Design a binder for this molecule. Structure first.
Ligand SMILES: [Cl-]
Ligand SMILES: [Cl-]
Lengths: 417, 417
């Protein structure tokens, strides 16, 4: 029942939340005990509210407020206009660099997802129907393995236990795969010497002979080291992700690697694709709607990759059920997204949405068929995680700073090997 | 009122039509007295019918029937799936070459447009709202000028008169621009010697000092000739379109031309973009939803161009009101489509849709705000143009064959100069 056949934005509520995260290691530090996210509730003059989810660093929250103010009074179907208004509001210029356009896309993304959610709700269509329609019923995900301590310093150890060697990594895989059924496995490396990470990979291969395997050391290696690793893992990895820093280095490694190289670090914005393509630095690009500017722009990224002969996967950061629902609709509607998607899901145990719509079964999530994004806010859960945010005092993600608070001389050097 | 919240295709009616066309000249011949199109009426189990419009050559009609049969039983929101089914049905492989994928896109396009029309109708949204939303209220078009005979042989001369020199071309512009208000002007060249076409361009510039101007000889020139033309028209043309054949030749000319080069001939499919981009052959690509695979894929083309630093315009072939409505919604929703679009509109005087929704005023068409494509079939007009198709006996477009039926020794050689 829309006057003037118009459904437009009346305001947005941005709610920062914090949820428990284990001490997962990576090449620059260790995860803090709480990860942060911002929930966007986008309100309209039809009484329909759409959901989006993004980062929650201090500067980002400020940008999210400026954005929320700039788009009041806009149709939820006018997402092109909404991006431009956010660009004007941020005073933006509309490899691996966060350009002004990259900032605009990170700020626009959660509003775009919330807009599509409202679009789906008002039309009776699932979000995947707004993206060309689902091409598969369910979206497969990977088991995202990390070396980890047993506990945050001075806190109760979690149920995972530590993983600091091949045995520990294999036990982690077994527990994760029994609970979720993942049929592909990714190891976060750049933490131990390459030979020890190769050994974890070989051990996973022996324990799970049919699981595709990936390794991502976040550019912790020189090109010369990366080529040795790639030779040593020939026929073992589905792809090698960001072994070494920079497009030139990646191109050098790619020329010698028997498996494809993937990246999320060198290509995080549209303006970075032409150089990545010209240099042959990578064969697979990891999508991520959270920094590419929402779902429609992620579909554009997928079409560009297809056109230029690049494979397509999906990158993840610690996230909750709103992001998960958006990931699933996006992947369901993307013909060339055939790699299993990364997710941090197993690492959290809290959420802001009502349960039931995002069950994993055999490693995959069925795409919801209901109108909109397919999940709804649980206001009590949201208030609780907001309260947790206020009380835990963490205001920015800082893996390195947190590592230094424990080990003051720690450096986030790289490459390390 | 959709059972299972499902609206799916029950069948398609393909109706070939023919409408009067003047004897317009181009570098390969002269237009036949009737141009051909196929109207797609896409029927659904909700009783909503969507409209699409495409070519009507013999082989294309056959492909359109195979496509219509393959997609019965599919949701109009499942356009990704529908393209894949058409690809399977055609047994397809899913510069300027008509690859199997290009064939698939030409066949899919009118069904995709008809699907979006149904989507808009069922959701209450104009098609532009399905493409990210309009960013402008009206879409500007160009005056598409041609050298022409006074009449088809043995027929009544049309009201335009002949145009065979600069004076005739200027008089044609004046009549067209008084009727339609176009604020940009394009000349179809490759018909007379370049020096005479340069003179028509200079005469248009003198007669319309503020109108952007374009010239397109359909690759009738050598690179050396093209550079002379471009030097001689420095500061006069908004772009020079397809002056010379092949990506290498275009790149040679582009390096010396003071204005951007445009193309529709060298880049007509997604698989042709990487080489065009790598060679620097062009600065502007002409979109055309009729062969790029419908509106969503045209939005993808627009995003690829934006990403790789290419300007975006729009190409046209003789067409009716269904294509016109689709062109307008597409252009309204495309932020980087800022060149005036080409259209053959002034050259016909017949249509298959009810009048009123596509008025030109000051060179531009307001984007319809109604649900769907915004135009509807006039069944009497459609029957009449179908009857005209059957009776006129023309079954394929053949500018060269028709020129030879008048002048047997005629050759479609090129380049000519
Ligand atoms: Cl608006
Ligand atoms: Cl279907």
């Amino acid at each position: 029942s829309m006057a003037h056949n118009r459904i437009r934005i009346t305001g947005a509520r941005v709610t920062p939340v914090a949820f428990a995260d284990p001490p997962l290691l990576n090449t620059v530090g260790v995860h803090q005990p709480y990860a942060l996210r911002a929930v966007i509730q986008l309100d309209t003059d039809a009484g329909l509210t759409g959901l989006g989810e993004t980062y929650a660093d201090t500067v980002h929250l400020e940008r999210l407020q400026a954005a929320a103010h700039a788009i009041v009074g806009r149709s939820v179907f006018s997402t092109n206009v909404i991006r431009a208004l956010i660009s004007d509001a941020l005073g933006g210029d509309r490899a691996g660099m966060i350009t002004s356009a990259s900032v605009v896309d990170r700020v626009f993304s959660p509003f775009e997802v919330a807009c599509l959610d409202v679009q789906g709700q008002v039309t009776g269509r699932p979000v995947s129907d707004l993206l060309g329609g689902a091409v598969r019923d369910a979206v497969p995900f990977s088991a995202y393995l990390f070396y980890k301590w047993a506990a945050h310093p001075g806190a109760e150890p979690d149920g995972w236990g530590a993983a600091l060697d091949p045995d520990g990594i294999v036990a982690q895989a077994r527990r994760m795969i029994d609970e979720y059924g993942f049929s592909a496995i990714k190891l976060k490396g750049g933490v131990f010497a390459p030979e020890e990470e190769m050994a974890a990979v070989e051990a996973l291969r022996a324990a799970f002979p049919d699981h595709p395997l990936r390794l991502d050391p976040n550019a912790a290696w020189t090109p010369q080291t990366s080529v040795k690793v790639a030779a040593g893992l020939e026929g073992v990895l589905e792809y090698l992700e960001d072994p070494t820093p920079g497009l030139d280095g990646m191109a050098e490694v790619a020329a010698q690697a028997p498996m494809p190289l993937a990246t999320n670090m060198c290509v995080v914005a549209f303006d970075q694709l032409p150089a990545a393509v010209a240099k042959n630095s990578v064969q697979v690009v990891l999508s991520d709607h959270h920094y590419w500017g929402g779902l429609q722009r992620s579909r554009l990224l997928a079409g560009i990759c297809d056109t230029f002969g690049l494979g397509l996967s999906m990158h993840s950061n610690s996230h909750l059920g709103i992001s998960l629902a958006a990931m699933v609709h996006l992947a369901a509607a993307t013909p060339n997204l055939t790699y299993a998607c990364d997710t941090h899901w197993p690492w959290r145990h809290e959420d802001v949405v009502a349960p039931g719509a995002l069950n994993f079964c055999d490693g995959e999530v069925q795409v919801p068929a209901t109108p909109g994004l397919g999940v709804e806010i649980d206001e009590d859960a949201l208030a609780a995680l907001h309260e947790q945010y206020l009380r835990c005092g963490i205001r920015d993600r800082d893996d390195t700073g947190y590592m230094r608070s424990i080990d003051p001389g720690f450096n986030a050097s790289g490459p390390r090997w």
